[PDB]
């Protein structure tokens, strides 16, 4: 685990990780639901998380913080009141800072299960958020997130 070799639950993927999930412990139940409800209805994914000691099964494993860019294409940013104030947001921010002023933004997808009052950090400030709290987009929501993930950042191949 961590950075140790011989670790490859998925048979060592040259594909690497698609996205890294960072979320708040206070709204963990929604995230636990998300990861499994993705795989049950999606175009096949393979992700990882910051804290994996919890979660229901979830096919993920531990990687290096200094290698998040080298391991995962994207980061799933769970924007909750507890997230914006907890270490999790700072972690995601440090990653985004090592990427690039603009490119990082396309590499961070903000997910919102609830509706808070807190203000946004400029490092993400909602580029393209998917509100699970709104039944309008909560229909093929997991498949929509899965679509946005399965698409490599924004590699313009599928038409445009």
Curated annotation (Swiss-Prot):
PTM statement from Swiss-Prot or TrEMBL: Ubiquitinated; undergoes 'Lys-63'-linked polyubiquitination. OTUD4 specifically hydrolyzes 'Lys-63'-linked polyubiquitinated MYD88. Deubiquitinated by USP3 that cleaves 'Lys-63'-linked ubiquitin chains leading to inhibition of MYD88-induced NF-kappa-B signaling.
Consequence recorded when altering residue 138 to A: Slightly reduced activity
Outcome following mutation: residue 59 to S: Abolished interaction with E.coli TcpC without affecting ability to promote Toll-like receptor (TLR)-mediated cytokine production
Effect of residue 86 to N: Found in hematological malignancies; uncertain significance; somatic mutation; constitutively activates NF-kappaB complex activation
GO MF terms, alphabetically ordered: ATP-dependent histone chaperone activity; death receptor binding; identical protein binding; interleukin-1 receptor binding; molecular adaptor activity; signaling adaptor activity; TIR domain binding; Toll binding
Effect of residue 60 to F: Found in hematological malignancies; uncertain significance; somatic mutation
Effect of residue 53 to A: Slightly reduced activity
Modified residues (Phosphoserine): 100
Tissue: Ubiquitous.
This protein's GO CC annotations: cell surface; cytoplasm; cytosol; endosome membrane; extrinsic component of cytoplasmic side of plasma membrane; extrinsic component of plasma membrane; nucleus; plasma membrane
Effect in UniProt of substituting residue 34 to I: Found in hematological malignancies; uncertain significance; somatic mutation; no effect on NF-kappaB complex activation
Quaternary structure, from the entry: Homodimer. Also forms heterodimers with TIRAP. Binds to TLR2, TLR5, IRAK1, IRAK2 and IRAK4 via their respective TIR domains. Interacts with IL18R1. Interacts with BMX, IL1RL1, IKBKE and IRF7. Interacts with LRRFIP1 and LRRFIP2; this interaction positively regulates Toll-like receptor (TLR) signaling in response to agonist. Interacts with FLII. LRRFIP1 and LRRFIP2 compete with FLII for MYD88-binding. Interacts with IRF1. Upon IL1B treatment, forms a complex with PELI1, IRAK1, IRAK4 and TRAF6; this complex recruits MAP3K7/TAK1, TAB1 and TAB2 to mediate NF-kappa-B activation.
Noted disease: Immunodeficiency 68: An autosomal recessive primary immunodeficiency characterized by life-threatening, often recurrent, pyogenic bacterial infections, including invasive pneumococcal disease, beginning in infancy or early childhood.
Protein function: Adapter protein involved in the Toll-like receptor and IL-1 receptor signaling pathway in the innate immune response. Acts via IRAK1, IRAK2, IRF7 and TRAF6, leading to NF-kappa-B activation, cytokine secretion and the inflammatory response. Increases IL-8 transcription. Involved in IL-18-mediated signaling pathway. Activates IRF1 resulting in its rapid migration into the nucleus to mediate an efficient induction of IFN-beta, NOS2/INOS, and IL12A genes.
Protein's name according to its UniProt entry: Myeloid differentiation primary response protein MyD88
Organism whose genome encodes this protein: Homo sapiens (Human)
Lineage: Eukaryota, Metazoa, Chordata, Craniata, Vertebrata
